[PDB]
């Protein structure tokens, strides 16, 4: 059910997504171990993910949350990195593959910092890096992130 | 896992690294939609 629509670099929607990706890079306490050493990205492609059933699944849940929270879904746009992005875009996120070992227990994790999500593209802690060169700081291999609409509703605040 | 009772997500606020942004966890896959797929390279600092 999923189709991918390529955005033109001249499209303001491409531009605003790229700005969010670029502007939320930061340095990491691992000195680049997991995600690589970089200050910016070369954006190769930005595709809209179009799937009517997955969208309706989202908006159904969003309305449920909103109704439980004074008509406030508390919707954010956040990054997600993992080796499973190609499954996610076809089948949706599935909490049965939740990050069992995350800081906040077994759920599905998102970041404001694109560079945080980048640390997970090749696996937890960057795994062994890119499949071709086994390099977590590979500058050659193409990487993929999702930029996702996320319903937070009433969020539990964990200082950490 | 489930969200904490009376909550729909968790927000991980940074308490050490002053420059880190927040991280978030949801416990239901239906609470996120993958709007954009971004293909990229990281760039070697000049
Ligand atoms: C084949 O799988 C499927 C098949 C069919 C349908 C759906 C899917 N998959 C899923 O829905 C799914 C759901 C959850 C996860 N894992 C996670 O959330 N993590 C954390 C990875 C990460 N951590 C972060 C921490 C802080 C801030 C940002 C992030 C971030 O950006 N990413 C774990 C991983 C486990 C193995 C490699 S990484 C993965 C897929
Ligand atoms: Zn590589």
Curated annotation (Swiss-Prot), chain B:
Transmembrane intervals: none
Expression (tissue specificity): Highly expressed in placenta, skeletal muscle, liver, brain, kidney, heart, thymus, spinal cord, lung, peripheral blood leukocytes, pancreas, lymph nodes, spleen, prostate, testis, ovary, small intestine, colon, mammary gland, breast and breast carcinoma, and in common-type meningioma. Highly expressed in fetal liver, heart and brain.
Post-translational modification: Ubiquitinated at 'Lys-48' and 'Lys-63' by RNF146 when auto-poly-ADP-ribosylated; this leads to degradation. Deubiquitinated by USP25; leading to stabilization. ADP-ribosylated (-auto). Poly-ADP-ribosylated protein is recognized by RNF146, followed by ubiquitination.
Cellular compartment(s): Cytoplasm; Golgi apparatus membrane; Nucleus; Chromosome, Telomere
Family: Belongs to the ARTD/PARP family.
Function (record text): Poly-ADP-ribosyltransferase involved in various processes such as Wnt signaling pathway, telomere length and vesicle trafficking. Acts as an activator of the Wnt signaling pathway by mediating poly-ADP-ribosylation of AXIN1 and AXIN2, 2 key components of the beta-catenin destruction complex: poly-ADP-ribosylated target proteins are recognized by RNF146, which mediates their ubiquitination and subsequent degradation. Also mediates poly-ADP-ribosylation of BLZF1 and CASC3, followed by recruitment of RNF146 and subsequent ubiquitination.
Assembly and interaction partners: Oligomerizes and associates with TNKS. Interacts with the cytoplasmic domain of LNPEP/Otase in SLC2A4/GLUT4-vesicles. Binds to the N-terminus of Grb14 and TRF1 with its ankyrin repeat region. Interacts with HIF1AN. Interacts with RNF146; this interaction leads to ubiquitination and proteasomal degradation. Interacts with NUMA1.
Protein name: Poly [ADP-ribose] polymerase tankyrase-2
Species this protein is from: Homo sapiens
Gene: TNKS2
Region of the whole protein represented: 1116 to 1161 of 1166
């Amino acid at each position: 059910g999923t189709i991918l629509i390529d955005l033109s670099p001249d499209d303001k929607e491409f531009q605003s997504v790229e700005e969010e990706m670029q502007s939320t890079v930061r340095e990491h306490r691992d000195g680049g171990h997991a995600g690589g050493i970089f200050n910016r990205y070369n954006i190769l492609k930005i595709q809209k993910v179009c799937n009517k059933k997955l969208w309706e699944r989202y908006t159904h849940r969003r309305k449920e949350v909103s109704e439980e929270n004074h008509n406030h879904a508390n919707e954010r746009m956040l990054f997600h990195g993992s080796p499973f992005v190609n499954a996610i875009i076809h089948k949706g996120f599935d909490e049965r593959h939740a990050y069992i070992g995350g800081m906040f227990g077994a759920g599905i994790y998102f970041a404001e910092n694109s560079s945080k999500s980048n640390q997970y593209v090749y696996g937890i802690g960057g795994g062994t890096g890119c499949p071709v060169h086994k390099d977590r700081s590979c500058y050659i291999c193409h990487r993929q992130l999702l930029f996702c609409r996320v319903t937070l509703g009433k969020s539990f605040l964990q200082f950490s | 896992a489930h969200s904490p009772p009376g909550h729909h997500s968790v927000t991980g606020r940074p308490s050490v690294n002053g420059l880190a942004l927040a991280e978030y966890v949801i416990y239901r896959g239906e609470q996120a939609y993958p709007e954009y797929l971004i293909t990229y390279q990281i760039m070697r600092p000049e």
